[PDB]
Amino acid sequence: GAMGSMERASLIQKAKLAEQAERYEDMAAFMKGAVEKGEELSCEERNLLSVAYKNVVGGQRAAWRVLSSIEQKSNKGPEVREYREKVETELQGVCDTVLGLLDSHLIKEAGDAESRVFYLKMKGDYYRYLAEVATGDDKKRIIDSARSAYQEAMDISKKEMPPTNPIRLGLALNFSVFHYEIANSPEEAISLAKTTFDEAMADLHTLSEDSYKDSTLIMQLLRDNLTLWT
């Protein structure tokens, strides 16, 4: 696309600059360009991709929730619905773009557990965002697509990664949020967060100080959700 003329390394450099400048739409466009070069992503590059799109979709989701709340209080003319729909369509477009990158061809080339779990977690997350706004014939299929991606990620992570691995912990956190917020399964959410926390706690003794900091940060986020939910 529009980034086809730019060197891969230059796209990555500019993504880092865009992050420092808080230009997340630019960051996402640079990272989309980098993915489309066709090469696998390193760990650092995967994180750049994730940060970029999380910020973009995060802004859209926040706007959608503001507008949806106004719309539900209205229930005036068609403007609130129209503008909510505009934001919704834009959000869906970004999710479809991310899912498209994962399907063409990041997941299929990802053979190491760390990369494959990372991408499948992403796939779950972006289907989850589609689920948040879905109301038509395919809504159950969207929810099931999220579930399936998260479940494959969980199965790989349990076999191949320590219980303290940050990607494994973040996956469990997000899958637990899926259960609570999307699948109407609060008990499953709570069980997953609890078991994840406990298994991580038991493995902290193996870690360096720096790895300990990372794992315990995500453990605290699990605990925070457990507190909110109980």
Binding site: N47, S50, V51, G170, L173, I218, L221, D224, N225
Partner: peptide, 8 residues
């Protein structure tokens, strides 16, 4: 409920 934030 809060999901995973961006890394610190």
């Amino acid at each position: 409920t809060p999901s995973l934030p961006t890394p610190p």
